[PDB]
Paper text:
We use this C49S/D72A double mutant to determine the crystal structure of the cysteine-phosphorylated form of PRL1 (PTP4A1). Small crystals of PRL1 C49S/D72A were obtained with 4′-MUP in the crystallization solution to maintain cysteine phosphorylation. The asymmetric unit contains two PRL1 molecules. PRL1 displays the characteristic cysteine-based phosphatase fold, composed of a five-stranded central β-sheet surrounded by two α-helices on one side and a four-helical bundle on the other side. The omit map clearly shows the density corresponding to the phosphate attached to the catalytic cysteine 104. The positively charged side chain of the catalytic Arg110 interacts electrostatically forming a salt bridge with the negatively charged phosphate group. Hydrogen bonds from backbone amides in the P-loop and an alpha-helix dipole stabilize the position of the phosphate. All three structures show the loop closed with the aspartic acid positioned above the phosphocysteine, ready to initiate hydrolysis. The structure of PRL2 bound to CNNM3 shows an aspartate sidechain inserts into the PRL active site interacting with the arginine in the PRL P-loop. A side-by-side comparison of the structures of the PRL–CNNM complex and the phosphocysteine intermediate shows the phosphate group precludes the CNNM aspartate entering the PRL active site. Mutating the alanine to serine increases phosphocysteine hydrolysis more than 15-fold. In the absence of both aspartic acid and serine/threonine, the phosphocysteine intermediate of PRL1 is stable for weeks.
Residue numbers in the entry: 9 to 26, 28 to 160
């Protein structure tokens, strides 16, 4: 469980539980996460998660493949609204391995928050070493930001 914080944003990058749901739920609730963004095939049932009060959003894309335009647009709007309506909260992004798709979204949040892509890569790699493969680093390098988040 690795946590990334920048300005008004706080993220928890997680993976499929190593160990079962109860420990997982308790940990998320303790971190203040109000939303889980699952971008891959997930190994747990949402029904218990939602009963605990954490909405799950399922925006999957292929491992190593870049997220669709819609996914990026939807993610950036969620980041824009959620942290303002619930200041101090945490957003969880979940990946199969917690090394590619989930850090990629967090990198996009950091870039749209003012970081250049190399700053964001290092910012996440400081918390989760070995994140991002070559295909994914190139995507972050080529990404051209909308630059519409306000702080």
């Amino acid at each position: 469980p690795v946590e990334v914080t920048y300005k008004n944003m706080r993220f928890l990058i997680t993976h499929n539980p190593t160990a079962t749901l109860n420990k997982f739920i308790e940990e998320l609730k303790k971190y203040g996460v109000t939303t889980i963004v699952r971008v891959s095939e997930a190994t747990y049932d949402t029904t218990l998660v939602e009963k605990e009060g954490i909405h799950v959003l399922d925006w999957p894309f292929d491992a190593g493949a870049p997220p669709s335009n819609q996914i990026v647009d939807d993610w950036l709007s969620l980041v824009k609204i959620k942290f303002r309506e619930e200041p101090g909260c945490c957003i969880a992004v979940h990946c199969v391995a917690g090394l590619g798709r989930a850090p990629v979204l967090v990198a996009l949040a950091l870039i749209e928050g003012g970081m250049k892509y190399e700053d964001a890569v290092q910012f996440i790699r400081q918390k989760r070493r070995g994140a991002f493969n070559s295909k994914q680093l190139l995507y972050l390098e080529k990404y051209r930001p909308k630059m519409r988040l306000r702080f």
